[PDB]
Amino acid sequence: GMEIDRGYISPQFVTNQERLLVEYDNCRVLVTDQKIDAIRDIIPILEQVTRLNAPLLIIAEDVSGEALATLVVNKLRGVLNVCAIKAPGFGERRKSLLQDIAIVTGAEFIAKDLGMKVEQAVVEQLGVARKVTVANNTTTLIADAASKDEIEMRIAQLKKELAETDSVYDTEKLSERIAKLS
């Protein structure tokens, strides 16, 4: 499946005690490049997802403070299965990867540059992954919600970048991104 080089933000999210893994089926996915720290930011979507009986994976710039504390407590006390991971990479590269993840999961990228805020997120904006496995250092998503036209559009976009790039690093990352999308 599709791998992300980031693991769980807290080990308290673990569902598999023996393997120290988070293991979800049919998981809803929040995709954002915003930091989630204030409890007010996370409460609305948490309330909505709790009603749905679905697991939730949160991908954000970071999750910390009271917002993280609220997530761990709701998981530990059996309200819902939820896990947070950091968005991969940095800067424009992080943005590009989140766009990829949004496409693959059919999520709306709650992007800071477009003025989208986590506080007004609704379930409609969440993506879905068939299988989610979160380890301490990596995450693997299996998804079937992607529009194949969107995938082909994205690959065409990345194709031009790959043909044009002259660095080994970007050559490696772009060619592997096209693989993750394919």
UniProtKB/Swiss-Prot annotation:
Induction: By heat shock. It is found in: Plastid, Chloroplast. Belongs to the chaperonin (HSP60) family. This protein shows ATPase activity. Oligomer of probably six alpha and six beta subunits. This protein binds RuBisCO small and large subunits and is implicated in the assembly of the enzyme oligomer. This is RuBisCO large subunit-binding protein subunit alpha, chloroplastic.
